[PDB]
């Protein structure tokens, strides 16, 4: 089914990515850095899918290569290039999202993309300098073989280690770092927002109150919420001398309202609550709107698209990376049939993502 599953990928992938590259270039033109990186990602997937039918037809005939040497070199280099270009573009996407969310650049983006393509081309140099056609014994079976001589011994070990480390370990670590910092910032913003929403709700129930018991309970909840919100300092002393001072004044006004409400004077409690409403604008409203803007980037479709692409890419590539690690362990002598049995399965599912990378745009768009 591997020969025919590739045929399925080419049909959907070429149709999907060609629509994707047009959309990111014409309907939503290159107005953001992430748009540039997604355009480059779609172009890289198209470049790999161009050489995919060569692999499909090569697997269709029970692993025999009808084309020349150059087609073999191009196909192998395209496989390696797709891996490296995709991982580098995804890491740059994650870094850009982290900067956009936590630290709110086009020529630098284009320079980054051309540097990524240059690095991916350099990392595919061994496959474009060693791969060659090879007649298998006295039969006519010709395959796209890797020829590493005595001078370049243990080169496959090095290439496998580079794929597992440079292509999977550093990208995974950098993306995890960026996304955990993003989640930290989101948690702080959500803490501030939730505490202020509880404060506003209790302020409203103070306004529509009859006796002092309800006022006292609402002021208690408001004081707890304000103390909690003062803890949630925005991620990144001009700020602490103003954020904490604003909340100190806020809780002082809550204390004044509680002092007035304990005596039984409801109207003065209402007045103090209104003064608290006034104080919100002077000190806390800027941080409230900043937290709201930071939380707005989650409902952004492009953030969901990037996160889904990153997660699905790494899920698809985990089997191939771990099997490459097992194979390099076997070659290095540390450690078998199962490793070779599912190797075509891993190489097929690893590059299956190019088939449905457009589909995310069609589901999260």
């Amino acid at each position, epitope marked *: 089914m591997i020969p025919t599953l590739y045929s399925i990928i080419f049909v959907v992938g070429i149709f999907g990515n060609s629509l994707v590259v047009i959309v990111i270039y014409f309907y939503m033109k290159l107005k953001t850095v992430a748009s540039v990186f997604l355009l480059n990602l779609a172009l890289a997937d198209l470049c790999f899918l161009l050489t995919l039918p060569l692999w499909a037809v090569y697997t269709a005939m029970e692993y025999r290569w009808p084309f020349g040497n150059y087609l073999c070199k191009i196909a192998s280099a395209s496989v390696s290039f797709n891996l490296y270009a995709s991982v580098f573009l995804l890491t740059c996407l994650s870094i850009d999202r982290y900067l956009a969310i936590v630290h709110p650049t086009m020529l630098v983006a284009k320079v980054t993309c051309i540097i990524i393509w240059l690095l991916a081309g350099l990392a595919s140099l061994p496959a474009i300098i060693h791969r060659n056609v090879f007649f298998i014994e006295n039969t006519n079976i010709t395959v796209c073989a890797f020829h590493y001589e005595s001078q370049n011994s243990t080169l496959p070990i090095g290439l496998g280690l580079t794929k597992n480390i440079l292509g999977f370990l550093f990208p995974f670590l950098i993306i995890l770092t960026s996304y955990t910092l993003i989640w930290k910032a989101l948690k702080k913003a959500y803490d501030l927002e939730d505490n202020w929403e509880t404060l506003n709700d209790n302020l409203k129930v103070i306004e529509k109150a009859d006796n002092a018991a309800q006022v006292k309970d609402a002021l*208690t*909840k408001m*004081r*707890a*919420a304000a*103390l*909690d919100a003062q*803890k949630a300092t925005p991620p990144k002393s001009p700020e602490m001398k103003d954020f904490r001072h604003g909340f*100190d004044i806020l*809780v*002082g006004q809550i*204390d004044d309202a*509680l*002092k007035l409400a*304990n*005596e039984g004077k409801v109207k003065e409690a209402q007045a103090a609550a209104e003064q608290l409403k006034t104080t919100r604008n002077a000190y806390i409203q800027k941080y409230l709107e900043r937290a709201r803007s930071t939380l707005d980037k989650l409902n952004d479709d492009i953030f969901k698209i990037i996160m889904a692409i990153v997660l699905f890419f790494f899920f698809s590539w985990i089997p191939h990376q771990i099997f490459t690690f097992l194979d390099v362990l076997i070659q290095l002598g540390i450690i078998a049939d199962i490793v070779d049995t599912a190797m075509p399965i891993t190489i097929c599912i690893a590059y299956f993502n190019n088939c449905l990378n457009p589909l995310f745009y069609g589901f999260l768009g």
Partner: antibody
Amino acid sequence: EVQLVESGGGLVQPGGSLRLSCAASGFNVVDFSLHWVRQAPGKGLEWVAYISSSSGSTSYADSVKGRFTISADTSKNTAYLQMNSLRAEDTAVYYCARWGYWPGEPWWKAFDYWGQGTLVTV
Amino acid sequence: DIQMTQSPSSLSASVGDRVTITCRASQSVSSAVAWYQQKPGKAPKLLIYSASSLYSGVPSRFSGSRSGTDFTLTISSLQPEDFATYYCQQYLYYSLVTFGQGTKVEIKR
């Protein structure tokens, strides 16, 4: 040298009146709120009353509301608790705790310095 | 009216053991939960003034932690001077002070 001492505790008849005094040394009462916390024998601590001398605002626990009168003199840095219509439950050890003022770390150090506590029985 | 409840009503452990007291508030009180130690026949002493901030002068073995409405007091190196009663006080506001039921450390035999 900062401390709070209690005075006026002793054996009094039920239904009478008591005057528990709390003398403060090493700090100014105007800068702190003086709370009275009772502890029944063989039982946990229960908050009774408080006075904020600067603001003048006082509060009481629901169980003792309407029977106690807490006041303070800032000249001698002293607090006073006046108890009327004593009951069986009021037999306890009373502590004069000191609590800071918002904002800052003085407020977050709740009852950093307690008093020695005086036992009152009915 | 915020109610503090302590689960370990009675605790017994040997010297050098680690003990943990959990106190839960009826509602959110922020980090406004102090931990006091009261020896029998003596006034209580403040150990932890925020939810998880150690008071000055007390031994460093005592630690606090806040998880929503669950406040935990932890003792690692239980020296023979830690056999007293422990109270959690919610001090969200001056008139809203509520102490816990209590937890006394006993010698395990």
